[PDB]
């Protein structure tokens, strides 16, 4: 396939070829144009707070070691020995001053440097240029309020710029709340779906909630429960949708601070969020203080998703076109009482973790939609994302980005796939920029 010319995503992001969820050649091409190019979630300060702390993470199909340096910075390196290529670190987290390879014993520092080679003097003499043999380093590592992202491409925009208009919506909870912590370790499960299926669902699919999650809404005892079995549609301006230049987007469900949590947490959460909102009104204004305690379903392009307030944090780690390894953490506000933090983390896993009953409702939807992308008569068929098209706006006085002022729609799918087409048809960041010089006009056409 010629990705310079092939229309995988139609103008304005209105539809996508179904093969995108199943084609292995495209998956390989995404490794280059999506995963090697864009910002990918690694870890949180809370998981590697002290010098020497490290974790392993995936970046696309590659594995990296993410390490807290002595000076307080974080550096990340491919988890691959520079000698004969053995995987250096076989654990998920720890604290160490360096990493020794189990094959020939080469020792690398937490800073990636080749620090020792067994019997170096006797064997290599002075011939080994250890300075040129440091671990392959992730070019860019940046933080968004403690959430650490990496990018293999030194030409990428800064992380804050890459978040674009989505950052404004995240800041009330990520910054003004006093900050969040990530509670590990994550759940880890493999699903037989393409990574884009859950990423698109979290970035902008409120339509599925009432029907897909009918059983979880009814038995679950949660605040959004009136939607079970499409018994009811959300109110007036019960929410909105947004998307951004670099593909990140989210839904906003006003005031839904207890999120997916069962009735056993609803009163406590609604009290806590409302109390903080009252303080935030004076600091960031009423609209942003309300956004803080509003449920955001968002995807940070390409493959990191979250539900704020519910506290669900996901990484959709790609394995092949129909295999994804799902990592699930909980996010909690740092100033919540410890006991509430613990209960909230368990509730996140209860609902969206490996035995998450809500997450279970989505399995078949994501796996069959993905696998159908391999079937001959469906490869060239069109997945539709036109709901709300011609009603989105750009440049609103209050809510930034391309915004659909309704709780349910497909605005965010269109922005995600727009950005996706622009990357898959581009060889570098400059070309992506050229292809995106009118990103918001393309998304608001007909309005």
């Amino acid at each position: 396939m010629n990705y310079n010319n092939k229309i995988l995503v139609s103008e304005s992001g209105l539809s996508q070829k179904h093969l995108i969820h199943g084609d292995e050649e495209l998956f390989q091409h995404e490794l280059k144009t999506i995963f090697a190019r864009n910002w990918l979630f690694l870890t949180h300060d809370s998981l590697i707070p002290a010098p020497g702390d490290y974790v392993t993470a995936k970046m696309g199909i590659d594995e990296v070691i993410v390490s807290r340096q002595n000076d307080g910075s974080i550096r990340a390196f491919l988890n691959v020995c520079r000698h004969r290529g053995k995987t250096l670190v076989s654990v998920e987290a720890g604290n160490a001053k360096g990493f020794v390879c189990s094959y020939h014993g080469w020792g690398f520092g937490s800073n990636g440097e080749l620090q020792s080679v067994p019997f170096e003097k006797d064997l290599y003499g002075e011939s080994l240029n250890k300075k040129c043999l440091g671990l392959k380093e992730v070019a860019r590592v940046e933080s968004f309020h403690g959430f650490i992202y990496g990018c293999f491409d030194q030409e990428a925009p800064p992380l804050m710029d890459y978040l674009g208009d989505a950052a404004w919506y995240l800041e009330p909870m990520f910054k003004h709340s006093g900050g969040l912590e990530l509670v590990g370790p994550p759940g880890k499960v493999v699903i037989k779906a393409n990574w884009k299926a859950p990423a698109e669902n979290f970035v902008g699919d409120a339509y599925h909630v009432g029907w897909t999650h009918a059983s979880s809404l009814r038995s679950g005892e949660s605040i959004f429960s009136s939607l079970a079995g499409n018994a009811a549609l959300p109110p007036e301006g019960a929410g909105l949708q947004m998307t951004s230049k670099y593909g990140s987007g989210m839904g906003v469900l006003w005031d839904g601070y207890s999120g997916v949590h069962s009735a056993d947490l609803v009163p406590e959460l609604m009290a806590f969020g409302g109390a903080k909102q009252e303080r935030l009104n004076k600091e960031i204004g009423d609209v942003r203080a309300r956004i803080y305690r509003s449920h955001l379903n968002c995807t940070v392009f390409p493959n990191n998703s979250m539900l704020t307030c519910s506290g669900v944090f996901k990484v959709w780690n790609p394995i092949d076109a129909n295999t994804t390894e799902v990592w699930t953490y909980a996010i909690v506000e740092k100033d919540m009482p410890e006991d509430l933090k613990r209960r909230l983390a368990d509730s996140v896993q209860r609902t969206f973790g490996p035995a998450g009953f809500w997450e279970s409702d989505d399995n078949d939807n994501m796996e069959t939609a993905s696998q159908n992308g391999k079937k001959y008569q469906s490869r060239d068929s069109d997945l539709l994302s036109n709901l709300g098209f011609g009603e989105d706006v750009y440049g609103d006085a209050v809510y930034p980005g391309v915004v659909g002022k309704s709780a349910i729609g497909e605005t965010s799918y269109r922005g995600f796939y727009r950005a996706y087409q622009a990357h898959v048809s581009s060889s570098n960041w400059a070309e992506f920029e050229h292809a995106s010089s009118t990103w918001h006009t393309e998304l608001t056409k007909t309005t």
């Binding site: 590990g184 370790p185 897909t212 069962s262 078949d364």
Partner: protein
Amino acid sequence: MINIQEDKLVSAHDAEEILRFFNCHDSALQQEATTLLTQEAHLLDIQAYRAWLEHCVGSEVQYQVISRELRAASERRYKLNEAMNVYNENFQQLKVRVEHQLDPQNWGNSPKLRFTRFITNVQAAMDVNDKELLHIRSNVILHRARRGNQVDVFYAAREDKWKRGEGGVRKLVQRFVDYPERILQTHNLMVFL
């Protein structure tokens, strides 16, 4: 018997459980525990989840399955949360999960799933302090088949406490499983181990 300073790979918890069963063996108790677990597994296999809750699960239950982060065997400095809870349920939380299974809009339950459980290695020992409580250890292979060609097999050891109850109806007051696979390859862990 076990000395964990010598048996370098053994955890303190695991050594404590060995001690509990190697002492004071009561063959009748072992057989009673086998019957009890076999009946529980039969109720679960036929998806009689309400009957399982009513007949087998105590009001004070803690039903817990953890996933432990992979750490170096020589690790001694990193002290953050070691595990997460795939399950950590009280009775009401189990009831929510049972209602979710029985809801006619649980689309994933049509066509009907098929479960087959294999319970082995049963050991039982009375609690030293609380004479209402029996410690039962058992291993389980759980086979779940659905939708023509989906087959998932789960493997685990279970550390249970069961109370005598009333009228001879023993009820589970604690189940603890440390799930052996860190990354699940069964789509989910939506099964009662």
